[PDB]
Every structure is written in structure tokens, then in C-alpha cells.
């Protein structure tokens, strides 16, 4: 989101996999920040979701 209300394009990243214990949920290229930014990070699951340590490379 660039204004705090509306969220833009939605991209699907495999955040889990059966019987795999090292996945590295990652997105290569995020866009250029104009003024502000926020992230949604929505998940739809039937299995537990554990998430920690979100980070970016702002440069």
C-alpha cells in the first residue's frame, strides 16, 4: 500500500510445503517507494503459520 488504505497488486509466494523444513519465503524485487509504503502479507491456510523477522534491502 502506498497511501495506507488501498493495497495494490497481489503476488503469490509459496510460504509452506509439506515435509520441507527450509523454504526461505522471499520476494526478489519490490518496487520504488514514492512517499510511503506498507505490506499486507496475507495467508490462507489449514495448517499453522509461523512467521518472524521480516526484512528488506532498502539501499
Amino acid at each position: 500500500t502506498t497511501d495506507g488504505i488501498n493495497y495494490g497488486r497481489e503476488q503469490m509466494i509459496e510460504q509452506n510445503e509439506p515435509f520441507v523444513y527450509d523454504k526461505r519465503v522471499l520476494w526478489k524485487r519490490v518496487g520504488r517507494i514514492r512517499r510511503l509504503i506498507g505490506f499486507k502479507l496475507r495467508v490462507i491456510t489449514k495448517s499453522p503459520v509461523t512467521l518472524s523477522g521480516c526484512q528488506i534491502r532498502l539501499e
Binding site: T2, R9, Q11, K28, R29, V30, G31, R32, R34, I37
Partner: protein, 152 residues
């Protein structure tokens, strides 16, 4: 080749700069895309100095047809890389960026390869001056009273 339009060239330049691509989550606005298209047109007009500059086959869109973006540029397959690298270099200023060393080197190399063939064609030798004799070795020219080179 997929880079078929001026919009495609601008998108390639943005992808090179890292500002916008197909994998991004935030994109630049169409007004910014139009401004970049106008900068591409200005750069090509500056290069092609009304026929005495760098010839590439670029087509300058007319204002009668409303959108300049979306018209095929008409460049050959070997000039697209140079053109969009130079475009990225030119439009990096706008976003408070600076084109990286690889981008600048590729831009220089592409411009050089763009002008190589035109330089080879233009490397012409002037004719003999108006004050050279043709020489008596040219018997055929001697028999026709062609004793001096015309010139010009």
C-alpha cells in the same frame, strides 16, 4: 523480439533502473511513463540531427494520433539494447538515482555500435581535384579530349 513499442522501451529502461518491472508490487504512474516516452523522443531527435546524426530507423510519432506511446519505434533488433540503456541513463535523474557503472558502459558501447556502420558508410574519399590531369595512361580518355578531372 518483445520490445516492440516506445512503451516497451520505457518499461525496459525502468526495469534496468530497478524502479518498475513485472515482478514489482508498486508501479510508476502513466503520467511518468508518458514523460519518459517524451524524453526518449527528445533523445532520439537529438541523436538524429535531422538526417545528419545517427540513423537507426526510429519513427517519430505525430500529434494527430493522440498517444505517442504504443507506436512501434521501428528500430532494428540490434539497436533496442543501446536505445533503452541510453533511455535508462537519461531518465535516472528523475527519481534521484544514478545509472550504475554497467549501465553506463553498456550505453557507451551501444551508441558506438549504433554509429559504427554509419561511420563506415560516411568514410568517403573526395574525387580528384579539378586541376589533376587524367594522364596519358588513359588512352581512351585521351582520345576523347578528357585531359583533366572534373572535380566537385
Amino acid at each position: 523480439m518483445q520490445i516492440k513499442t516506445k512503451g516497451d522501451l520505457v518499461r525496459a529502461a525502468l526495469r534496468k533502473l530497478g524502479v518498475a518491472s513485472d515482478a514489482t508490487l508498486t508501479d510508476v504512474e502513466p503520467q511518468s511513463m508518458q514523460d519518459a516516452v517524451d524524453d526518449l523522443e527528445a533523445m532520439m531527435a537529438e541523436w538524429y540531427q535531422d538526417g545528419k546524426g545517427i540513423i537507426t530507423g526510429y519513427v517519430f510519432s505525430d500529434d494527430e494520433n493522440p498517444p505517442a506511446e504504443g507506436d512501434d519505434h521501428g528500430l532494428r533488433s540490434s539497436a533496442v539494447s543501446a536505445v533503452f540503456h541510453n533511455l535508462a541513463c537519461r531518465i535516472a535523474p528523475d527519481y534521484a538515482l544514478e545509472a550504475t557503472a554497467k549501465i553506463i558502459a553498456t550505453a557507451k558501447y551501444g551508441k558506438e555500435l549504433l554509429y559504427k556502420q554509419t561511420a563506415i558508410s560516411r568514410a568517403k574519399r573526395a574525387p580528384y581535384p579539378s586541376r589533376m590531369p587524367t594522364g596519358s595512361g588513359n588512352s581512351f580518355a585521351n582520345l576523347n579530349e578528357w585531359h583533366y578531372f572534373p572535380g566537385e
